[PDB]
């Protein structure tokens, strides 16, 4: 509420599907990714429209709407 579906592509061609809502923080979207891909949120970068989404911000703060495509890039930490 308002639940939506987005897509997350890895750097090895894999496509992940998430059910999200625009109030979800980037912290929460990463926790969903941890559930399906086993990647701790401190080792995730989420890229959209040429910028890496920052923790604390939400989905609307980046104007991400239904069926947008994010890019997951792994990091060592931080």
């Amino acid at each position: 509420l308002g639940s939506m579906q987005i897509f997350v592509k890895t750097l090895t061609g894999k496509t992940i599907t998430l059910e999200v809502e625009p109030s979800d923080t980037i912290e929460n979207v990463k926790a969903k990714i941890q559930d399906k891909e086993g990647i701790p949120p401190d080792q995730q970068r989420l890229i959209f429209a040429g910028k890496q989404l920052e923790d604390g911000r939400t989905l609307s703060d980046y104007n991400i709407q239904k069926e947008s495509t994010l890019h997951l890039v792994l990091r060592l930490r931080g």
């Binding site: 890229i47 429209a49 040429g50 910028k51 890496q52």
Partner: protein, 219 residues
Amino acid sequence: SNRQEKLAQLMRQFESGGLYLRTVSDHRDEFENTFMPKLDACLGHGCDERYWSSATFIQQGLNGKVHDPHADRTGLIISADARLGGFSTFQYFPGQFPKFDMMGAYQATWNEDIFSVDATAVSEQQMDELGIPDEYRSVFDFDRIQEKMAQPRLAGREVEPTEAKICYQPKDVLGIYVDVDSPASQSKARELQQAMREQGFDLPFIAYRGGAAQELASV
């Protein structure tokens, strides 16, 4: 201009510096909700730059593909004189165009400092400092589209659909794109060309593919 004057201007641009091709999945939506609002403004108080569109760069000898996933689109051949808002090799007004392809730049350089900047708001010097290669950078004038495509055009290698964001006026529509191998494309182009001639824009049918283009009588 009449049909023959648009064709001659079309060919002249195609055989020299190139121009734009914009395929559409819904010609009726494109005609009713983009072209007509543009003409209403032009026949009224003046043409305005409210509607921006996605297009591909085409030029004689440039073996370029258009964006047509299901091989069933018609489209518009658009003059090179159209307002340009950004071009890349891979709900909009200018400013939203990325200056470089962030993900493409990263799989080339693997420089994790790329993620510290906004690709829609980065300086020329920082891109240089980041080492962003030229093939992943956007360009913002027509001559630099020509330069960026000069190497594939001369080699004759086939290249993937490119995208520019353009603001075309009714003046700038020079032809109707037809895919020769697709009955659906020909049916859509048939309706689009009729609707536009009835508005005063008699346009040639243009069969484009592989850096070559030829006018057609009907489709």
